[PDB]
């Protein structure tokens, strides 16, 4: 089997991407944030504290004839950005772009943090990291990909995120018309539960390539590109007026600037992030100070190849017995 779904930016800055997901019988369609950095499929629901729901579409398990309470199971997750959610668990039928899993754990939110409430466009998350990170207790549950894998034509999914435009998540096949040149594959460590890999270096604009190992995660659920302070300083040094602002919480730059591109290495291959992808606009409405899309990972504890990097590539998440990651230009 295969599946193919369009993923759409939630706003004009590509702050996140939503993908429609059918849950239950009859289908209830929710727009979920596909997140290769976590492993829980959780939704706003009829059980969510009413004051914490503000415009989201909810899953109502009582209206699904295939929903079953997973007795005794609870979940609770905290994300790298400080947001969180928790609740109980149902199993139900979940389909993504024509690909159907029966008995998928659907984690129903009883509580969500303010960040989630305030984002009316995201109805929940669909985790695509390794199932070892799944938070369901006392019986850990499998991700949608893990459950689908055996049935897929090939045990892979691909992320093709757009810049200010829709893109695609495919399951079970590689669309050879969706990228240019070849896909370069690189080793993955699953030791921390993530799609963790080592980039071979970077360049800033038309500068020379610096060969240096950068260990980090491919994370569709993180907006920006978080890299070591040395790398980030080298980038922003090429932008007149750019500075790190503690009050704002990262590098800012004059909105009048033209940003240089940033290249990262995948083996001997190179992915070029155009400068425009690195512009996240005014820090506040009407400001001429703009927020940068490349930020330091110092104090996160891990480097994160988030959407800013991934949307410059066609990315293969290969879930073979020994997982690997593939990157192509597009």
UniProtKB/Swiss-Prot annotation:
Ranges that cross the membrane: none
The Gene Ontology biological process annotation of the record reads: proteolysis
Instruction: Give all residue intervals belonging to the Peptidase A1 domain.
Output: 17-328
Q: What is its EC number?
A: 3.4.23.22
Recite the UniProt keywords alphabetically: Aspartyl protease, Disulfide bond, Hydrolase, Protease, Signal, Zymogen
The positions flagged as active site in the entry are: 35, 199
Please give one Gene Ontology molecular function term for this protein. Answer: aspartic-type endopeptidase activity
Q: Does the keyword Signal apply?
A: yes
Catalyses:
Hydrolysis of proteins with specificity similar to that of pepsin A, prefers hydrophobic residues at P1 and P1', but does not cleave 14-Ala-|-Leu-15 in the B chain of insulin or Z-Glu-Tyr. Clots milk
Record-annotated disulphide pairs: 255-290
Q: Per its UniProt entry, which superkingdom is the organism in? A: Eukaryota
Q: Does the keyword Protein transport apply?
A: no
In the record, the note on similarity to other proteins reads: Belongs to the peptidase A1 family.
Can you say what this protein is called? Endothiapepsin
- Species of provenance: Cryphonectria parasitica (Chestnut blight fungus)
Q: Which residues of the full protein are shown?
A: 90 to 419 of 419
């Amino acid at each position: 089997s295969t599946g193919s779904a369009t993923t759409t930016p939630i706003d004009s800055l590509d702050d996140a991407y939503i993908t429609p997901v059918q849950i239950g019988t009859p289908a209830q369609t929710l727009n979920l944030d596909f997140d290769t950095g976590s492993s829980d499929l959780w939704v706003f629901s009829s059980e969510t504290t009413a004051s914490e729901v503000d415009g989201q579409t909810i899953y109502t398990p009582s209206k699904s004839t295939t929903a079953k309470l997973l007795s005794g199971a609870t979940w609770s997750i905290s994300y790298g950005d400080g947001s969180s959610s928790s609740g109980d668990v149902y199993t139900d039928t979940v389909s993504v772009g024509g690909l159907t899993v029966t008995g998928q754990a659907v984690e129903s939110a009883k509580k969500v943090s303010s960040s989630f409430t305030e984002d009316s466009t995201i109805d929940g998350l669909l985790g695509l990291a390794f199932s070892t990170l799944n938070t369901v207790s006392p019986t850990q549950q499998k991700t949608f990909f893990d459950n689908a894998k055996a049935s897929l034509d090939s045990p892979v999914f691909t992320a093709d995120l757009g810049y200010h435009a829709p893109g695609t998540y495919n399951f079970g096949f590689i669309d050879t018309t969706a990228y240019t040149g070849s896909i370069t594959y690189t080793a993955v460590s699953t030791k921390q539960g993530f799609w963790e890999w080592t980039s071979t270096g970077y360049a800033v604009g038309s500068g020379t390539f610096k060969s240096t190992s950068i260990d980090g995660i491919a994370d569709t659920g993180t907006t920006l590109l978080y890299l070591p302070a040395t790398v980030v300083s080298a980038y922003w040094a090429q932008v007149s007026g750019a500075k790190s602002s503690s009050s704002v919480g990262g590098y800012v730059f004059p909105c009048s600037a033209t940003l240089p591109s940033f290249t990262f290495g995948v083996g001997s291959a190179r992915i070029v992030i155009p400068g425009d992808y690195i512009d996240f606009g005014p820090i506040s409405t009407g400001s001429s100070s703009c927020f940068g899309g490349i930020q330091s990972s110092a104090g996160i504890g891990i480097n994160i190849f988030g959407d800013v990097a991934l949307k410059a590539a066609f990315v293969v998440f290969n879930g073979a017995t020994t997982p690997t990651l593939g990157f192509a230009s597009k």
